[PDB]
Amino acid sequence: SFNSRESSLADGQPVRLYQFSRGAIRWSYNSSDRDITYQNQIFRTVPGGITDNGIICSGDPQSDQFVITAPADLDVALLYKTRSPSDAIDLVVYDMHYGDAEAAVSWVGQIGDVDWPTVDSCRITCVSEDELMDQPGLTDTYCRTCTAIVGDHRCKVNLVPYRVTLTPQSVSAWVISSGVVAGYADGWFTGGYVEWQVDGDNYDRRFIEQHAGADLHILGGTEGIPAGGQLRVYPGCDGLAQTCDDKFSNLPNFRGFNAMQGKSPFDGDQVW
């Protein structure tokens, strides 16, 4: 009846539904003045209303953004206030008419940017998957180092055995200290990242600038790190062939070119 209602000249009762999902956690909002139950999901009513600006599909990712307006107290947007969540918040938009149990999917995407122009409002800019095609695609260089992030699909190195679970001893503005890591050689954890559970099955990740003794340096500060929460810390690969094989014994998968050639052409001037 959704299509029939759209074609109807007197039963038009538009209502737009938004679904923000991050793994196992979902946030449901509706633009009407009362909650709507759809597919066993109830959508909350935001005091003040939630509205968008329209959907544009012109083939230009930079121009085809989707804008959401909502109060500054919106739960899903509140997360971005202090620090952007590590994972992207997928957004799905449905369209349905009051009194009908059928809805149609209109827009699908993820959060691109969030800002709070006024205390009584917040503007969210949503981007589609098409915008991820503007970055280069070379991803190849003939250099000495590995040119591969430890654990990627190219290194084929399993980090689960190297996982270390610990409770930090003391947390400071920029340094998190723990005695368990003090037993490892300096720089063992350099290049690794720290992941811990925020809510449900979602974890927030932070990279490590440097590891020295019992003190760990966290890039961008330690804000948001629970002082007593359980933390998982993985090591980091420098990328050198000696580092790759002595520590991880992954030399066969070494993607770097240590000593094949640095400059030698076959159309130079004098070989000697």
Partner 1 sequence: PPLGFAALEERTWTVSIGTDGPPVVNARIVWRLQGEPNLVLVITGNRIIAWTFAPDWGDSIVERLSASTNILQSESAVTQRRAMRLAPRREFDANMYAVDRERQLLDMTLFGWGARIWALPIWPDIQLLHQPLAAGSLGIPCDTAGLDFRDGGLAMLRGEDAFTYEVVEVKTVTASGLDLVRPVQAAWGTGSRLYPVRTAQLTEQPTLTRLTDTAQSARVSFLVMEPSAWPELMPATTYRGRPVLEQRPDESEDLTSSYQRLLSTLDNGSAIPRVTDVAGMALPVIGHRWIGMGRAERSAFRSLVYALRGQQKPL
Partner 2 sequence: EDLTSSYQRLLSTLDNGSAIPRVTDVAGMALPVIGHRWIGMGRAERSAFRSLVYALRGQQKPLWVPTHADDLTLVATVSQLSTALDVRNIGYARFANGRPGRRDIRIELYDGTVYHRRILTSTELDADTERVAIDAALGRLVEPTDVARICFMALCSAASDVVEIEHVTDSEGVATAALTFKGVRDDEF
Partner 3 sequence: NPGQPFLIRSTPRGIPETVVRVGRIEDNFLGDGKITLTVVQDQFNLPAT
Nearest distance from C-beta of residue 215 to partner 2, angstroms: 44
Nearest distance from C-beta of residue 54 to partner 2, angstroms: 15
Return the residues of window 186-215 that contact partner 2 according to CB under 8 A: none
The helix (run of H) or strand (run of E) holding residue 76 is helix 75-78
Q: Taking a C-beta distance cutoff of 8 angstroms, is the pair 187, 210 a contact?
A: yes
- Please state, in angstroms and rounded to a whole number, the distance separating the CA atoms of residues 89 and 124: 12
**Residue 138 makes contact with partner 1 by CB under 8 A:** no
The partner in contact with residue 9, picked from Fe ion, partner 1, partner 2, none with C-beta cut-offs of 5 to 8 angstroms by kind, is partner 1
The partner in contact with residue 155, picked from Fe ion, partner 1, partner 3, none with C-beta cut-offs of 5 to 8 angstroms by kind, is Fe ion
**Residue 123 makes contact with partner 2 by CB under 8 A:** no
Counting every residue, how long is the chain?
272
- Enumerate binding residues for Fe ion (CB under 5 A): 146, 155, 237, 244
7, 47, 59, 137: which one contacts partner 3 (CB under 8 A)? 59
Burial class (CB in 10 A: 0-12, 13-18, 19+), 171: middle
- Please state, in angstroms and rounded to a whole number, the distance separating the CA atoms of residues 101 and 98: 8
- Please state, in angstroms and rounded to a whole number, the distance separating the CA atoms of residues 11 and 24: 36
**Residue 12 makes contact with partner 1 by CB under 8 A:** yes
Nearest distance from C-beta of residue 243 to partner 3, angstroms: 49
Residue with tokens 């599909």: 57
User: Which residue lies nearer to partner 3 by CB, 59 or 136?
Assistant: 59
User: Which residue lies nearer to partner 2 by CB, 49 or 200?
Assistant: 49
Nearest distance from C-beta of residue 47 to partner 2, angstroms: 4
- Please state, in angstroms and rounded to a whole number, the distance separating the CA atoms of residues 165 and 150: 19
User: Count of residues binding partner 1 (CB under 8 A)?
Assistant: 9
Nearest distance from C-beta of residue 117 to partner 1, angstroms: 21
Burial per residue of 15-52, b for 16 or more beta-carbon CB atoms within 10 angstroms, e otherwise = bbbbbbebeeeebbbbbbeeebebeeeebebbeeebeb
List the beta bridge partners of residue 264.
none
Return the residues of window 95-114 that contact partner 1 according to CB under 8 A: 98
Burial class (CB in 10 A: 0-12, 13-18, 19+), 257: middle
Residues that bind partner 2 (CB under 8 A): 31-34, 45, 47-51, 69, 71, 118-121
Residues that bind partner 1 (CB under 8 A): 9-10, 12-14, 32-34, 98
Residues that bind partner 3 (CB under 8 A): 14, 16, 31, 51-52, 54-59, 95, 106
